[PDB]
């Protein structure tokens, strides 16, 4: 919300590098060069197939949550969706975009 | 007896106790409002209001009022009492000045968004109602 006057749902991908750099080392990236870890990590990890500069906040906070703990390999992404839909409380049709 | 039974939920099929709250908070969340107007002819005042050194000075200026209040004692002198009065006048005046300088930048329409933001306005309003009954 620092760069966003209101929620607006989505932000541009140009400022994503600065957004990921402006996070604490425990949550974001270490003090080392982001060209080796951040660039490869953002591409390798699963991200929703949205437009060039419209990515929702729930499409990024969920990705960070997944990366923080028990990150799973590609292809088995539906197991996490099943776990949320069967263990966590009601999704209220909010995981439709979060599936990808 | 509440640490066990209290958190006696057995839904931890795959997720540990750390995931019992973070996933739920991720599911239920909403970005806040920053309220950033460009407005070039008052953008300078807007930047001055919302700046780290300004608040770093506000803290040490507000705590001075409380340090002044924690100085009155029984059967104090008349000159000390008058100094207390003039310090109170200075403090209420500077609070009014800061409030009127802030409301221009943050606008009256968003002035009620933050609980502490509009609360200080009542403090200034209250501090001025009894300004003429002292003398």
Closest chain A residue by Cα to residue B9: A87
Taking CB atoms and an 8 Å limit, are A69 and B33 in contact across chains?
Answer: no
Closest chain A residue by Cα to residue B19: A69
DSSP secondary structure string, A1-59? --S-SS--SEE-STTHHHHHHTS-TTTS--SS-HHHHHHHHHHHS------SS-EESHH
Helix (H, G, I), strand (E, B) or coil at B74: coil
Q: Give me A17's structure tokens.
A: 């590098």
What b/e sequence results for A3-36 when a residue is b if at least 16 CB atoms lie within 10 Å of its CB, and e otherwise?
ebeeeeebbeeeeeeeebeeeeeeeebeeeebee
C-alpha distance from B17 to closest chain A C-alpha (Å):
12
User: CB B52: neighbour CB atoms within 10 A?
Assistant: 7
CA dist B117 and B121 (Å) reads 7
Residues near A88 by Cβ (< 8 Å), separated by ≥ 6? Answer: B23, B24, B27
Calculate the alpha carbon distances from A72 to A81, A87, B28, B101 in Å.
12, 17, 23, 53
Chain A segment 9-48 residues within 8 A of B by beta carbon are none
Helix (H, G, I), strand (E, B) or coil at B68: helix
CA dist B23 and A41 (Å) reads 21
Q: Tell me the H-state helices in B9-134.
A: 19-27, 40-49, 52-69, 78-106, 115-129
CA dist B102 and B28 (Å) reads 33
Q: Give me A23's structure tokens.
A: 């996070």
B67 touches chain A (CB under 8 A): no
Closest-CA residue to B126 (of A45, B26, B118, B32): B118
Closest-CA residue to B17 (of B33, B30, B4): B4
Closest chain B residue by Cα to residue A62: B26
Residues near A57 by Cβ (< 8 Å), separated by ≥ 6? Answer: A7, A9, A10, A11, B29, B31
Instruction: Say which residue the tokens 């200075």 belong to.
Output: B90
Calculate the alpha carbon distances from B23 to A12, A66, A80, A83, B38 in Å.
25, 9, 11, 11, 36
User: CB B23: neighbour CB atoms within 10 A?
Assistant: 21
CA dist B85 and B71 (Å) reads 12
Residues near B33 by Cβ (< 8 Å), separated by ≥ 6? Answer: A1, A5, A6, A7, B113
CA dist A75 and A56 (Å) reads 22
CA dist B131 and B93 (Å) reads 11
Closest chain B residue by Cα to residue A91: B27
A50: buried, middle or exposed (CB in 10 Å: 19+, 13-18, 0-12)? middle
C-alpha distance from B36 to closest chain A C-alpha (Å):
5
Closest-CA residue to A58 (of A90, A98, A87, A24): A98
User: CB A56: neighbour CB atoms within 10 A?
Assistant: 16
Chain A segment 49-88 residues within 8 A of B by beta carbon are 57-58, 61-62, 65, 68-70, 83-84, 87-88
């Amino acid at each position: 919300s620092e760069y966003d006057p209101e929620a607006k749902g989505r932000i541009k991908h140009l400022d994503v590098v600065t957004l990921l750099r402006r996070i604490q080392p425990p949550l974001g990236f270490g003090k080392l060069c982001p060209h080796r870890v951040a660039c490869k990590r953002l591409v390798a990890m699963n991200m929703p197939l949205n437009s060039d500069g419209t990515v929702m906040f729930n499409a990024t906070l969920f990705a960070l949550v997944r990366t923080a703990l028990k990150i799973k390999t590609e292809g088995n992404l539906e197991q996490a969706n099943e776990e949320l839909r069967a263990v966590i409380k009601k999704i209220w049709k909010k995981t439709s975009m979060k599936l990808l | 007896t509440f640490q066990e039974q209290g958190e006696k939920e057995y839904k931890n099929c795959e997720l540990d106790k750390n995931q019992r709250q973070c996933v739920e908070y991720a599911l239920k969340a909403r970005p806040l409002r920053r309220y950033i107007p460009k407005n070039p002819y008052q953008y300078k005042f807007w930047y001055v209001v919302n700046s780290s050194p300004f608040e770093y000075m506000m803290f040490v200026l507000i705590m001075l009022n409380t340090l002044c209040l924690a100085m009155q004692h029984y059967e104090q002198s008349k000159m000390f009492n008058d100094a207390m009065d003039i310090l109170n006048m200075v403090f209420t005046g500077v609070f009014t000045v800061e409030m009127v300088l802030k409301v221009i930048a943050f606008k009256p329409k968003g002035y009620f968004s933050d609980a502490w933001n509009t609360f200080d306005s009542l403090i200034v309003i209250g501090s001025i109602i009894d300004v003429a009954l002292s003398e």
